[PDB]
Amino acid sequence: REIVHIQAGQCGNQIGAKFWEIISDEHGIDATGAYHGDSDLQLERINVYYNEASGGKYVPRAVLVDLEPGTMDSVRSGPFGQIFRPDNFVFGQSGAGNNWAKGHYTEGAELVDSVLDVVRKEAESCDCLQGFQLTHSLGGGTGSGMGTLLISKIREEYPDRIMNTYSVVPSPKVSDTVVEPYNATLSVHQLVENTDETYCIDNEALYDICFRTLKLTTPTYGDLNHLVSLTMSGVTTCLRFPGQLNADLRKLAVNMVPFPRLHFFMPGFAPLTSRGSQQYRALTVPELTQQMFDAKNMMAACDPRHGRYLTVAAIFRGRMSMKEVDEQMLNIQNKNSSYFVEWIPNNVKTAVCDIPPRGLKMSATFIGNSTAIQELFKRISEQFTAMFRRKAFLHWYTGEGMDEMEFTEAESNMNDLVSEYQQYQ
Amino acid sequence: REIVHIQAGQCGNQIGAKFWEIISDEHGIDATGAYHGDSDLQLERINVYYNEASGGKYVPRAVLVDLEPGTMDSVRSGPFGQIFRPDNFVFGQSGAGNNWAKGHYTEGAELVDSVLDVVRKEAESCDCLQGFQLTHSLGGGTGSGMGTLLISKIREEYPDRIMNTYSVVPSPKVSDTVVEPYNATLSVHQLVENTDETYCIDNEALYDICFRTLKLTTPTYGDLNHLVSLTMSGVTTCLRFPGQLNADLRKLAVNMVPFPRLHFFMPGFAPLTSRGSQQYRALTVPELTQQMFDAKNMMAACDPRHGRYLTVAAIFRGRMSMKEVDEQMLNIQNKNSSYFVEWIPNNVKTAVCDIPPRGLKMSATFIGNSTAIQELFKRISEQFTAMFRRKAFLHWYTGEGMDEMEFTEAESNMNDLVSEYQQYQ
Amino acid sequence: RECISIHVGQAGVQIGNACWELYCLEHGIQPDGQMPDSFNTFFSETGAGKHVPRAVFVDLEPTVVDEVRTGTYRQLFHPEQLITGKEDAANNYARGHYTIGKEIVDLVLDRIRKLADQCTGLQGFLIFHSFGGGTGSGFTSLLMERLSVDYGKKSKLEFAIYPAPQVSTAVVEPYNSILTTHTTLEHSDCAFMVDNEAIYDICRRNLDIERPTYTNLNRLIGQIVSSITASLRFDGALNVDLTEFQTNLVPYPRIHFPLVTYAPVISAEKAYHEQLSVAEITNACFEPANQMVKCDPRHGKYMACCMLYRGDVVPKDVNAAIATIKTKRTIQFVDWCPTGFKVGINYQPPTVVPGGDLAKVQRAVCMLSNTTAIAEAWARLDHKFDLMYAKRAFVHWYVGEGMEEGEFSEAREDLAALEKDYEEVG
Amino acid sequence: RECISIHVGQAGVQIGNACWELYCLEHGIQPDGQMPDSFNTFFSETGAGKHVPRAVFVDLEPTVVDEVRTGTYRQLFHPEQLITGKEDAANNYARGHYTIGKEIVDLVLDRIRKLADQCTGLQGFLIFHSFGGGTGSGFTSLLMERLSVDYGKKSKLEFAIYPAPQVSTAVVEPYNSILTTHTTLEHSDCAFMVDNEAIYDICRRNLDIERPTYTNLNRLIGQIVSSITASLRFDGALNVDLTEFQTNLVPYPRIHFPLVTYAPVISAEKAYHEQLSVAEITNACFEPANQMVKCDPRHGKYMACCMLYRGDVVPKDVNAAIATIKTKRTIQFVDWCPTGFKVGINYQPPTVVPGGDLAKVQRAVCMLSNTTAIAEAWARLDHKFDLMYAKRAFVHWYVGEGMEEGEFSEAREDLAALEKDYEEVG
């Protein structure tokens, strides 16, 4: 069971670099591809992400895609840069200039062939693959448009494998670019149907968590990428290590998604404690449980108390006991009987693993499928309406072959999605 | 809690010049902005009047005003001259003749903007500030004319926060400028409502206090200012250092001003001893207190034994025994019951700080507002009474054109102020 | 059996400091939380070799809070347990009730629901403040009303400071000390009242000391709280629970102002000459000169009381020793009460801290008894404010914040009703 | 990725001289072309220790270029890059465009083509000129026409000097500054307009220099250009490419006239007392007292803006400061632009040149705003031209050179149409 990794754009490349750093740290791999580990289980499922070479070296199943060379040079010269195979670095020379239209039609169409050939090679190498992890943002033009084309082609070639997207959706309070809503809406239009499940993440809530709960005075992008990397490592632990009760990607996919279109998730991690306030904190499951379920800690810029939790999944790591897990789950379900759906009893999925994160005793990851996602989208749509009515910035995209009718479809599809989430709330 | 400073007129600057020499020695800050102190308690509340800048330095939150260029040359060249930022200087180029006509009408509109921008600059720098300090002399026009309009605008924009004025009124015995009745008359109509607390200084007192209590043979403006600046420094120690009981500017007026109108304050400082007689005193709290409430040293030309004290405040410095003060206070409370207004028991306000003045074991200040306020003005009221009626020197002030109704409007307010002061005596 | 303590205002910080240092010495726990049974009652255990208080510091004033950050006993308190404000009330009741009350009340109330979550057999909360200033009056007054709403039938206690009639340092004190009285009658099962002057004579005469300072007033208040809770933390021949204590003390629902005083208080040398006998202390306890309450019990008729021994006491002298005063007519029993005492003995000898002003004594007694003499302590104050309000001086300050002019009357009517209530009971 | 800069006229040559000394200072290259990477964007390396720029110098008069030829920087340029004529335009638009233009217009174009053969990633051209003289108006307009036809979709930027309304030194300026609007309007991808008197005020007040001559003003403009291209020439936390910025700023094809400003500019002595932080410098970028063209944004509404920070900047305080600015009602934005900021952060601090009028800093900000205020900068000038066209003054000089009398009619009509567009969108 193998998973190949795809990264797109500057944001995706930075997130992926942090991920590969932490996971090589986890598995005992050094910075030069060597191995110096102790625990035997590290070798039991080392191949879920790595591929073997001559001389006893490992190289990851990674592809880096970008439309400019500066970020690729930065990742190559940075730490853990020699791990990757040089053939996997795929980058162009022109750039997109934050145009979705340029990213989809004019510039990415010429470069898509090389990356499809490389991912075809990686899928040839694998034994029996299951999933693709894609990392990007919905604000810029290169990542969003190029990755959308890439997902469309990949899905067309592979109709039975499972697909993952770990997106970043823009927020008005951390707004940075004058043409963000066009990018966001035009991407989501077909991200609705081309993927299997999508995790939503915001820079606004990440700043909130970093400043307040972490007590950080200087949150730089390294720390935000660090948080997202811990989530991404925590999702798929059941594959690389054993457990009393197991849950891989397909189990979560069948358990959390009641209808095909309702696959937009909000993650959370616990604990998150500062270096000085950890000495004064207990070590027990219940605190982890409320901290996950706390509305103050979620990594999406939306309040869950405005709706009801559709379904949830909890992933525990550490040596713990199952009775405690189920008692806490029923405690939360009974106390928060207002905030849980009624026509689906016992809305919690559970999993327990054995190997804890290095240097820590227990950890917990929460994935929630809720009804609040509509408010994360309507806030965007308004910003779109203030643009398309007076055709601001539209000629830049129209010069590339598009039309206003595609914007009409984009608005209509966003309306359909928000109506669908309002219907079942 | 933070506060910015304004100085106005000439005489304000020299009163300002010592306030910034003394406040540096309290905080250990050198003439170069460096810190050489030992107590970590100095830095606990250093941000109150100083702004943190890179280079390990501190700079004053001082704004300096003028209308003639002779005065700044003196304050620039003196000790602690470079402390002020060259931006902070505001001054004119023409001259007035200390006329309230030119102090408000002709020239006050032009230079209010520059200071109003500078004061607006200092508004955002702090987190959550509370007050300003204004110093000038009420004897002239520029001292008064700038003071009056600056006061009213600030209150109109900024009505929720406390405002301070540390004024100098002229007296019949020590009169210097020919039209001194005019300057008191037009300004006071504004301070009747437009400032929340006003501290009075009579310039007669600076002579009685220095020759007798201080036994000073040659009163220099170093010596006359040494007293006024020591009163300013004592009011705001509770802001900067801790103590068994704390008292800030909010805490006084809500507990020290009886009606909205009774806000003309009076200081008195202790100890005041000569350098030849300091070897012949003890170290106790009642020695100051009996000397404090005494009618000989209070810093205006009025004897409170002509009336009854309404509310008072006495601020003490050094490690004391609070039980000494309270058991001491009731002693004066019972003995001199003639000055205790019967329908208000317990007329005393107390403040103790732990960090004492350097080189002294203890020192103290007294601020008391009483029924003695009336005799302060009726002599002053009689002064102008003989002047307007015979119409001399009226035309030079009439060169700008305010009308004679406001004289009575002030005069009636003074009568109403005096009527309020006599009836509630 | 566990309890949660809340120290609010500046007055609550000293006593918050003195109490928690005192509890550290009793349990021998060094400030880092290490111990070199029943020790769980105030502390929460964290894994191994780490104990922390079940305490919260609350304030609008940053100068008096950040000191506990820097002193020796910073390490005890959690960082999240410790709350600061940005403006103090300027000695005003309703600012803590109206303007700045709701800006932090829900902030700390979230903590109380965290701290309420750890408990299993929760017993009650201790609230420390004063009736003098605005922070300790109004903003403390705000907390209980929400606290009473959420839980109800669990017991809730307060430790207050009254303003003295003769010797006081703030101008407007009854204004603050009138408005609280509406809440205290209607929102506390038991209200412990302590005043300033009673500390002064107790220290001057009994302690044989020169200048009792703010340490010394706190060490009395610290030693009082230690005495009430030692029945929870330990055992003896006779055990006293608050559920038994509330029923046996308060005879009608409106009678909840106990009178307290501590014995023996004495300097180090003077323990050399006296034999502290059990029959000796019990007679010395009820006498008016040690009273923390500025009242004369000779002007009140008693009904019921709580006496607390501690150390090595045998009950065989107790039957005679109270009967020793039972045969005294100067202190009186009501007609419908054959017996009016609650007994308390603790097998754990009292612990004296370094720096204290007591001599290590095997036996100590704190009194908790309610009398009808406490009526005069408000009656003088009730006259104090009535003179103050006629002229409507300073009132514009408080009008500017909104409250209606009839607020004074209801508690005063209840105060008079309470005063009339004491007459019908007395 | 490379760029080619074309300097025309006396003003263009002077500004280019300042800019190229600045670049050589930045990249550690001595005047003789040898360096004791990233320089390929402006420089070409030939064999061993020799760099030559991608620049061309143009004039119709020999003096201003022979001063370069004899000057200290003689060894750095090719001889073939310096092109001179024999009779200057005599401050005639007609002589520049028609009689004396075609005598040289071919040669430089050929040279331009040669330069384009060296590059592999042509980004765009930078043009320095002014609307005052006859050379840099007419011949530069002809050059842009030829370049636009020959290259098409390549981006072209200009850096113009608009004639001041009051402080002007020529008699016939309005004719030139009005007839240049056609070829700038229909053939330019980005247009920067700058006034001399506004820079004079900026020098007088902020820098406190008694006597500004042309060197200082040219140095300021060079600083602005260097800060704009530092995104290409270096690498940092965020990146803004040229076409990225055109996409984010220009809302409509006919509206490409941003207004520029720079911060901080501080005198040497006054720099010590101020400690320059991000919030105050992003405040300074919005001061009408530092806007580089004598216009009031207060009479207009912002449409979009771009900020380019360099030095030690992190995105948290950038977001905080932008949110702070968005809350002011004095700074107004159009309604259909909910977010109107493009932001870029670089890592390399700006470098101070010896003998300059600016002090060393750790951070810098360049602001480029698209507003509707700048419309007034034409409306006043449109009076000056028309008033002089009532009597047909000076017209015979232009008519004799092949120009016809209706040309000014279309000039006035085009300016009327462009002012109408700025009115209608605004």
Ligand SMILES: Nc1nc2c(ncn2[C@@H]2O[C@H](COP(=O)(O)OP(=O)(O)OP(=O)(O)O)[C@@H](O)[C@H]2O)c(=O)[nH]1
């Ligand atoms: N036992 C004790 N009494 C104190 C202490 N500090 C002040 N007091 C007395 O308590 C009275 C006021 O108590 P508080 O309610 O705390 O007033 P505060 O300290 O100013 O707090 P705020 O009213 O919020 O400003 C004063 O008159 C003092 O005599 C202390 O630290 N310990």
Ligand SMILES: Nc1nc2c(ncn2[C@@H]2O[C@H](COP(=O)(O)OP(=O)(O)OP(=O)(O)O)[C@@H](O)[C@H]2O)c(=O)[nH]1
């Ligand atoms: N910044 C700057 N501006 C200048 C300088 N010299 C002249 N100017 C401006 O240029 C205008 C003069 O017209 P120019 O375009 O320079 O005329 P020219 O460059 O001599 O070209 P010809 O008309 O052909 O002679 C004036 O309005 C000045 O404001 C300079 O050295 N620096």
Ligand SMILES: Nc1nc2c(ncn2[C@@H]2O[C@H](COP(=O)(O)OP(=O)(O)O)[C@@H](O)[C@H]2O)c(=O)[nH]1
């Ligand atoms: N977490 C994280 N987000 C980033 C980082 N860099 C940029 N972003 C976000 O990504 C969005 C822009 O995406 P962009 O870089 O333009 O995508 P690209 O055009 O493919 O390079 C912005 O809204 C940023 O908030 C990063 O290093 N970490």
Ligand SMILES: Nc1nc2c(ncn2[C@@H]2O[C@H](COP(=O)(O)OP(=O)(O)O)[C@@H](O)[C@H]2O)c(=O)[nH]1
């Ligand atoms: N207390 C005090 N008063 C001063 C000092 N210097 C001047 N004065 C008073 O200021 C008055 C004149 O001030 P004035 O010249 O009008 O200042 P201006 O308003 O700025 O022009 C005189 O009557 C002095 O009594 C000083 O150093 N200390």
Ligand SMILES: [Mg+2]
């Ligand atoms: Mg207080």
Ligand SMILES: [Mg+2]
């Ligand atoms: Mg020329």
